Amino acid sequence: PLEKASVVSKLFFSWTRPILRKGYRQRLELSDIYQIPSVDSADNLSEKLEREWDRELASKKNPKLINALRRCFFWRFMFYGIFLYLGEVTKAVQPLLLGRIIASYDPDNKEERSIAIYLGIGLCLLFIVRTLLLHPAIFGLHHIGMQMRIAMFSLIYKKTLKLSSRVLDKISIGQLVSLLSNNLNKFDEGLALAHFVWIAPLQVALLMGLIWELLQASAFCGLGFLIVLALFQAGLGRMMMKYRDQRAGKISERLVITSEMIENIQSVKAYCWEEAMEKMIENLRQTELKLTRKAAYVRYFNSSAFFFSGFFVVFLSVLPYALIKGIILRKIFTTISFCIVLRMAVTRQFPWAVQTWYDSLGAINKIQDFLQKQEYKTLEYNLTTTEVVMENVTAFWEPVLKDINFKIERGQLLAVAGSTGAGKTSLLMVIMGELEPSEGKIKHSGRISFCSQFSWIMPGTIKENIIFGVSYDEYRYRSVIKACQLEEDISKFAEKDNIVLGEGGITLSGGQRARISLARAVYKDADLYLLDSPFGYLDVLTEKEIFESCVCKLMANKTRILVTSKMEHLKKADKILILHEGSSYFYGTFSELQNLQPDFSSKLMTTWNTYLRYITVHKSLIFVLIWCLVIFLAEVAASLVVLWLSTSSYYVFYIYVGVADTLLAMGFFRGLPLVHTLITVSKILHHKMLHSVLQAPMSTLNTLKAGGILNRFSKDIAILDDLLPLTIFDFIQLLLIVIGAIAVVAVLQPYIFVATVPVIVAFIMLRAYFLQTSQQLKQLESEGRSPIFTHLVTSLKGLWTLRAFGRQPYFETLFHKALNLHTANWFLYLSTLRWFQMRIEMIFVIFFIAVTFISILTTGEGEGRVGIILTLAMNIMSTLQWAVNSSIDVDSLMRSVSRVFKFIDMPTEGGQMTVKDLTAKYTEGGNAILENISFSISPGQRVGLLGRTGSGKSTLLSAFLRLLNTEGEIQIDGVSWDSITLQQWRKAFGVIPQKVFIFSGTFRKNLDPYEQWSDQEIWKVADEVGLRSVIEQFPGKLDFVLVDGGCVLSHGHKQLMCLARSVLSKAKILLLDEPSAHLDPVTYQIIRRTLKQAFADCTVILCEHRIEAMLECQQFLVIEENKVRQYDSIQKLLNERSL
């Protein structure tokens, strides 16, 4: 339903209370969330910018996108804007009324509590009015952010459909999906921070006047310090990027090893490289960590400077007043409350305004450059005659097809043939009109329909693909479905044919996708049917039956053009045109072809424990936090000791304890290694994680897909290493200052201690009440990201089919639904977040009112006791917001620690041979593929592995090395199964599989990861096995770096490399999996003619599909359902199974 509101509910955000009550109670659902307001809709947001950009494009010479984008949303932006300026100034007006409250308790006059309280109530109201001013004003800017963001993704979606192919030639597919993904986060939220460019100048200009001169340049010298501190932060900020930019080289060099690791785990297990590839990675870490620390240390200086500045910035400006003996107690307090506001504006707030403008404007320019590109103008086909006329049509891809001419009457078929990859598609691109001709004359009319070589199947049911635009006609649908022959495939889905397919179509067969492609092509009515290799992925017999029938049935008098290489159809066709690399043989008929080309014609015929588990896996981290706490307890006591009690020291000593930002704060001497410990924790976690990924069951591992493993191992631990250590220091620093400040206030005035307890419990109660929804809602934001990307990917695949049919309104209308689902979900996040930020200040203001009331009303004897509490209590809130704000970010990051602990917590496991009672399974208690198998192999025999072809030779090959669930008992010439552990057991075997493992390094390292083989014998073995030459045709000797995953080396070389690796291991038994299939006769001879003397007195097991391919194999093994038997020779086997 469409939501509504009242003046109160709109201000306070009441509608959150239902959804928080719902979310805290029951688990939420995507359908449960209510609809968007009628203003926020892609149909609205596109149309408004379309007309603005249209009139903008036609008027000026150089049309600005920023101008058109602003001109639509300029006014309400300012309307929301002014409310921020109205609040931001009142922060600076605030501490005047402080001065009067301090000025009340001085021995001058008999002025009553009235004079305090009548101001104090106004000062208390000033917070309530500012709370009501700001929180709507910030929400409006976020709300405009949606109008800015949603319209742009919808607008560029028009352009991406209407590109030229000349642009599509340039592979900017990653560059586009990168261009989209980055934009949303930076552009939407940051529109609030962009408004402070003109606020801060007026803020500092007002704050200049508030700082009274006192015969000196007090404000200018005070600011002049802090601008150099800002320049120092900018300077540290500059070199911070260099460490990222430099370290970005190593992380990629590390990632490539882990990517190759996760793909080929079975090889690493087979060869048993546990100690080899831990040190290899950890050496790549050991350097990177040392750089990573320096990136953190500068950030620590950057952060700590902000907390330390507060003392220096005031103290440097105050002492100049003493130059003409300026001494006063009241005026030194109010300057703190003036200066911290100045610091907030210039140091932290204003640089974000400079950052976000520069960051946003460049992004607005980036898409504007992409928007103005060459577009595909859809040509007309409304001319008379309805005959496809061409004259001298020729072009370039980047004369590609010269001498092109044919004239088809309505009825006749055109047969196209030639060499593959010689413009055979490119002709149909010119006939469609996507790729324009460089010269010639094209004149074809009538409606066009296209059938692609690539299988195009969109997300959804097969029904939507078959119908696709045109209305339902059942009697024609019966002939179409009968023609294309899907009813058999439908009847398999006995209930109904509404299987929800996605991108590509992994479930249905490559033929069935082509049948759907043909069905979609032949369903629609059109005057020209372009068939670009429909019958590609289909078996000849079933292909011929459909092909020969449909050609007769469909073509009653329909104009068709087919790109093919099937002779019978060429003979049955009306006219033929055979091409040869942009040079035609002839024009006409097969009858002419038999005369003109006789040779060619004749040739074809959050968990609370994870905090404890994270914090208690490192000793030094326990000591440093205790050392932080003991000093925190030590200093906060010293404050009480001081506050228990020329005179330029005594009266000026108040400021240091008064500015809690410097007093209650850590630094270089006693809070530096807190980060250092956190950096070591990630290294310790990584070390164990990587070790726990290896040493695990293959059944448990292989069930988890690789993309999840690689991504969680690469992306998350980097965030855990980089971002997580700062937010902890921020959280601790911001906690300590608040808990320290609230204590020392409560020590002096004891009745505040009663007022704290309802406030402290409310924070913990309300935050825990708030989180339950937020995380659950943000879960739907992450999931609801994918529908847009998955739709935008698929739409790019079937571009020509979309253009040819002309179904762009359908895709555009469907695309809006993907936006609306995301906006409906995302918009609710700001509304809940606003309510939390609304209430959190209302929890504070009642505490502040209570502290102010009780302090003013009760009998305060001293003059400082009034000022200190008021000065601390006034300026604290800014930190209190950051403290509660940070914990949510810390908790959200710390959510991803558990998933690493899931990876840590997973479990850890003569040439004669005799197998007995072997039973193996894929998953634990799964399908028994091998069942009670028992057989023997004699010592020093070449064995032929045979059985049920297609049942699976790899599954049996996995059972030897033990890469699945296994049961039974196997021995190698009386050697036991249980005795040698599964790591050391594999030392006996030697596999030469289809895949071969390739390091990103040296041939010295490839042959010997343990580095315990001498070069003499490596070279002597390399001579025997036959690597001598190819090793010697490279730079160095064995030191050549194998870049790009072994591009230079062919298969045969990888076979020799894998062979040499085995020969150096003195393996007894060897397993050969398809040598002759991938390799070529010369390589097969080159391998086999050295392999036999290399393993003359060794056991060999060859597996082949061809029976004659294992003629040399002496022993034979037959495999079958519940039986395995050892045959002595060909005469035993060949006659028994066959005859």
Short mmCIF file of all heavy atoms in Angstrom, two decimals, residues 166 390-404 426-427 429-431 433-442 582:
data_model
loop_
_atom_site.label_atom_id
_atom_site.label_comp_id
_atom_site.label_asym_id
_atom_site.label_seq_id
_atom_site.Cartn_x
_atom_site.Cartn_y
_atom_site.Cartn_z
N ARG A 166 30.51 -0.25 -33.04
CA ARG A 166 31.87 0.31 -33.01
C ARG A 166 32.37 0.58 -31.59
O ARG A 166 33.56 0.43 -31.31
CB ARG A 166 31.91 1.60 -33.84
CG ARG A 166 33.31 2.12 -34.13
CD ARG A 166 33.26 3.24 -35.16
NE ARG A 166 34.58 3.78 -35.47
CZ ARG A 166 34.82 4.75 -36.35
NH1 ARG A 166 33.83 5.32 -37.04
NH2 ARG A 166 36.07 5.17 -36.55
N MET A 390 20.55 -4.97 -53.10
CA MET A 390 21.90 -4.51 -52.72
C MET A 390 22.72 -4.19 -53.97
O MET A 390 22.54 -4.83 -55.01
CB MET A 390 22.62 -5.57 -51.89
CG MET A 390 22.24 -5.60 -50.43
SD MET A 390 23.39 -6.59 -49.45
CE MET A 390 22.76 -6.30 -47.80
N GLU A 391 23.62 -3.21 -53.86
CA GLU A 391 24.54 -2.86 -54.95
C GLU A 391 25.89 -2.37 -54.41
O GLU A 391 25.98 -1.28 -53.84
CB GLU A 391 23.93 -1.79 -55.86
CG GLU A 391 22.93 -2.33 -56.87
CD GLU A 391 22.60 -1.33 -57.97
OE1 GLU A 391 23.53 -0.84 -58.64
OE2 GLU A 391 21.40 -1.05 -58.17
N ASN A 392 26.92 -3.21 -54.60
CA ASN A 392 28.31 -2.88 -54.25
C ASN A 392 28.53 -2.59 -52.76
O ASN A 392 29.27 -1.66 -52.40
CB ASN A 392 28.82 -1.73 -55.13
CG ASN A 392 28.58 -1.97 -56.61
OD1 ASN A 392 28.83 -3.06 -57.13
ND2 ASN A 392 28.08 -0.95 -57.30
N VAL A 393 27.91 -3.40 -51.91
CA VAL A 393 27.95 -3.20 -50.46
C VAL A 393 29.29 -3.69 -49.93
O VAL A 393 29.63 -4.87 -50.10
CB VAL A 393 26.79 -3.95 -49.75
CG1 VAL A 393 26.84 -3.74 -48.24
CG2 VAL A 393 25.44 -3.50 -50.30
N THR A 394 30.06 -2.80 -49.30
CA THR A 394 31.40 -3.13 -48.76
C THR A 394 31.71 -2.29 -47.52
O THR A 394 31.24 -1.16 -47.41
CB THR A 394 32.49 -2.91 -49.83
OG1 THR A 394 32.10 -3.52 -51.07
CG2 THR A 394 33.82 -3.50 -49.39
N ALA A 395 32.51 -2.84 -46.59
CA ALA A 395 32.80 -2.18 -45.29
C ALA A 395 34.15 -2.56 -44.66
O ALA A 395 34.92 -3.32 -45.24
CB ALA A 395 31.66 -2.46 -44.31
N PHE A 396 34.42 -1.99 -43.48
CA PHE A 396 35.54 -2.38 -42.61
C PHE A 396 35.01 -2.73 -41.22
O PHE A 396 34.01 -2.16 -40.77
CB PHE A 396 36.56 -1.24 -42.50
CG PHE A 396 37.61 -1.23 -43.58
CD1 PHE A 396 37.59 -0.27 -44.59
CD2 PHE A 396 38.63 -2.18 -43.58
CE1 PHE A 396 38.56 -0.27 -45.58
CE2 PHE A 396 39.60 -2.18 -44.58
CZ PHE A 396 39.57 -1.22 -45.58
N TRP A 397 35.69 -3.65 -40.55
CA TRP A 397 35.28 -4.12 -39.22
C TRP A 397 35.63 -3.10 -38.13
O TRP A 397 34.79 -2.78 -37.29
CB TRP A 397 35.93 -5.47 -38.90
CG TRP A 397 35.38 -6.14 -37.68
CD1 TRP A 397 34.09 -6.56 -37.49
CD2 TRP A 397 36.09 -6.50 -36.49
NE1 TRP A 397 33.95 -7.14 -36.25
CE2 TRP A 397 35.17 -7.11 -35.62
CE3 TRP A 397 37.42 -6.35 -36.08
CZ2 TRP A 397 35.53 -7.58 -34.35
CZ3 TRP A 397 37.79 -6.82 -34.81
CH2 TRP A 397 36.84 -7.43 -33.96
N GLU A 398 36.87 -2.62 -38.15
CA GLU A 398 37.38 -1.63 -37.20
C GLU A 398 38.14 -0.53 -37.92
O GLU A 398 38.64 0.41 -37.30
CB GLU A 398 38.28 -2.31 -36.15
CG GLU A 398 39.45 -3.10 -36.72
CD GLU A 398 40.38 -3.65 -35.65
OE1 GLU A 398 39.89 -4.06 -34.57
OE2 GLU A 398 41.61 -3.68 -35.88
N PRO A 399 38.18 -3.39 -47.61
CA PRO A 399 36.96 -4.11 -47.96
C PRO A 399 36.86 -5.47 -47.25
O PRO A 399 37.54 -6.42 -47.64
CB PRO A 399 37.08 -4.27 -49.48
CG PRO A 399 38.54 -4.25 -49.76
CD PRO A 399 39.12 -3.30 -48.75
N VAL A 400 36.00 -5.55 -46.23
CA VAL A 400 35.79 -6.79 -45.46
C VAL A 400 34.88 -7.79 -46.19
O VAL A 400 35.09 -9.00 -46.09
CB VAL A 400 35.26 -6.49 -44.02
CG1 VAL A 400 33.78 -6.12 -44.02
CG2 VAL A 400 35.52 -7.67 -43.10
N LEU A 401 33.89 -7.28 -46.93
CA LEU A 401 33.00 -8.10 -47.75
C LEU A 401 32.66 -7.37 -49.05
O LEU A 401 31.67 -6.63 -49.13
CB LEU A 401 31.72 -8.43 -46.97
CG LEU A 401 31.86 -9.37 -45.77
CD1 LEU A 401 30.58 -9.38 -44.95
CD2 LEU A 401 32.22 -10.78 -46.22
N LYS A 402 33.49 -7.60 -50.07
CA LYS A 402 33.35 -6.94 -51.38
C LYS A 402 32.55 -7.81 -52.35
O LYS A 402 32.52 -9.04 -52.22
CB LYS A 402 34.74 -6.65 -51.95
CG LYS A 402 34.76 -5.70 -53.14
CD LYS A 402 36.18 -5.33 -53.54
CE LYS A 402 36.22 -4.58 -54.86
NZ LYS A 402 35.61 -3.23 -54.77
N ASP A 403 31.93 -7.15 -53.33
CA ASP A 403 31.14 -7.80 -54.39
C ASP A 403 29.95 -8.57 -53.81
O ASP A 403 29.87 -9.80 -53.89
CB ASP A 403 32.04 -8.69 -55.27
CG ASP A 403 31.39 -9.07 -56.59
OD1 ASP A 403 30.88 -8.17 -57.29
OD2 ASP A 403 31.39 -10.27 -56.93
N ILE A 404 29.03 -7.81 -53.21
CA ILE A 404 27.84 -8.34 -52.55
C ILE A 404 26.59 -7.87 -53.31
O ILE A 404 26.30 -6.67 -53.35
CB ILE A 404 27.74 -7.87 -51.07
CG1 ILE A 404 29.08 -8.07 -50.33
CG2 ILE A 404 26.61 -8.59 -50.34
CD1 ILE A 404 29.58 -9.50 -50.28
N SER A 426 28.86 -10.94 -40.25
CA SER A 426 29.00 -9.52 -40.62
C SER A 426 28.14 -9.07 -41.80
O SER A 426 27.76 -7.90 -41.87
CB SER A 426 30.47 -9.19 -40.92
OG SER A 426 31.32 -9.58 -39.85
N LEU A 427 27.83 -9.98 -42.72
CA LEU A 427 26.86 -9.72 -43.79
C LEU A 427 25.47 -9.50 -43.20
O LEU A 427 24.79 -8.51 -43.52
CB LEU A 427 26.84 -10.87 -44.80
CG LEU A 427 25.89 -10.78 -46.00
CD1 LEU A 427 26.11 -9.50 -46.79
CD2 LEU A 427 26.06 -12.00 -46.89
N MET A 429 24.79 -8.63 -40.18
CA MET A 429 24.85 -7.37 -39.44
C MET A 429 24.57 -6.18 -40.36
O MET A 429 23.91 -5.21 -39.94
CB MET A 429 26.21 -7.20 -38.75
CG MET A 429 26.52 -8.23 -37.67
SD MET A 429 25.51 -8.06 -36.19
CE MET A 429 25.90 -9.58 -35.33
N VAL A 430 25.05 -6.24 -41.60
CA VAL A 430 24.76 -5.22 -42.62
C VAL A 430 23.31 -5.34 -43.11
O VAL A 430 22.67 -4.31 -43.37
CB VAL A 430 25.75 -5.29 -43.82
CG1 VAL A 430 25.36 -4.32 -44.93
CG2 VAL A 430 27.18 -5.00 -43.36
N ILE A 431 22.80 -6.56 -43.25
CA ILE A 431 21.40 -6.79 -43.65
C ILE A 431 20.42 -6.32 -42.56
O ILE A 431 19.38 -5.74 -42.88
CB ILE A 431 21.13 -8.27 -44.04
CG1 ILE A 431 21.95 -8.66 -45.28
CG2 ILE A 431 19.64 -8.50 -44.33
CD1 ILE A 431 22.17 -10.15 -45.43
N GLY A 433 21.41 -4.04 -40.38
CA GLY A 433 21.77 -2.62 -40.44
C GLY A 433 22.51 -2.08 -39.23
O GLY A 433 22.52 -0.87 -39.00
N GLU A 434 23.15 -2.97 -38.45
CA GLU A 434 23.90 -2.56 -37.26
C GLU A 434 25.26 -2.01 -37.69
O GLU A 434 25.60 -0.87 -37.37
CB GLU A 434 24.06 -3.74 -36.29
CG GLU A 434 24.80 -3.42 -34.99
CD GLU A 434 24.19 -2.25 -34.22
OE1 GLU A 434 22.95 -2.16 -34.15
OE2 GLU A 434 24.96 -1.43 -33.68
N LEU A 435 26.02 -2.84 -38.41
CA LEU A 435 27.30 -2.42 -38.99
C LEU A 435 27.03 -1.77 -40.34
O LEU A 435 26.57 -2.44 -41.27
CB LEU A 435 28.23 -3.63 -39.15
CG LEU A 435 29.67 -3.36 -39.59
CD1 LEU A 435 30.46 -2.64 -38.51
CD2 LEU A 435 30.36 -4.67 -39.96
N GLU A 436 27.30 -0.47 -40.44
CA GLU A 436 27.02 0.29 -41.66
C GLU A 436 28.08 0.02 -42.74
O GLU A 436 29.25 -0.21 -42.42
CB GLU A 436 26.97 1.79 -41.36
CG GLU A 436 25.86 2.19 -40.38
CD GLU A 436 25.75 3.69 -40.18
OE1 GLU A 436 26.79 4.37 -40.11
OE2 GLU A 436 24.61 4.19 -40.09
N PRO A 437 27.68 0.06 -44.03
CA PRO A 437 28.64 -0.13 -45.12
C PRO A 437 29.46 1.12 -45.37
O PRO A 437 28.94 2.24 -45.25
CB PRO A 437 27.74 -0.43 -46.31
CG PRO A 437 26.52 0.38 -46.05
CD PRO A 437 26.33 0.35 -44.55
N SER A 438 30.73 0.94 -45.70
CA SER A 438 31.62 2.05 -46.07
C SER A 438 31.21 2.62 -47.43
O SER A 438 31.28 3.83 -47.64
CB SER A 438 33.08 1.60 -46.10
OG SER A 438 33.34 0.73 -47.19
N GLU A 439 30.79 1.73 -48.33
CA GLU A 439 30.17 2.15 -49.59
C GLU A 439 29.27 1.06 -50.17
O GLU A 439 29.40 -0.13 -49.83
CB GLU A 439 31.22 2.58 -50.62
CG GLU A 439 32.30 1.54 -50.91
CD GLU A 439 33.17 1.91 -52.10
OE1 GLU A 439 33.26 3.12 -52.43
OE2 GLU A 439 33.77 1.00 -52.69
N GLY A 440 28.38 1.49 -51.06
CA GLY A 440 27.36 0.65 -51.68
C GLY A 440 25.99 1.28 -51.58
O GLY A 440 25.85 2.45 -51.20
N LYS A 441 24.97 0.51 -51.94
CA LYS A 441 23.57 0.92 -51.80
C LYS A 441 22.73 -0.25 -51.28
O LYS A 441 22.66 -1.30 -51.93
CB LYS A 441 23.01 1.39 -53.15
CG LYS A 441 23.69 2.63 -53.70
CD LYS A 441 23.10 3.04 -55.04
CE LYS A 441 23.89 4.17 -55.68
NZ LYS A 441 23.41 4.48 -57.06
N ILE A 442 22.11 -0.06 -50.11
CA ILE A 442 21.22 -1.06 -49.50
C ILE A 442 19.77 -0.58 -49.61
O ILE A 442 19.47 0.56 -49.26
CB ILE A 442 21.56 -1.31 -48.01
CG1 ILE A 442 22.99 -1.83 -47.86
CG2 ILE A 442 20.58 -2.31 -47.39
CD1 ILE A 442 23.53 -1.79 -46.44
N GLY A 582 35.39 -12.30 -48.36
CA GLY A 582 35.01 -11.09 -49.09
C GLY A 582 35.20 -11.18 -50.60
O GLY A 582 35.40 -10.16 -51.26
#
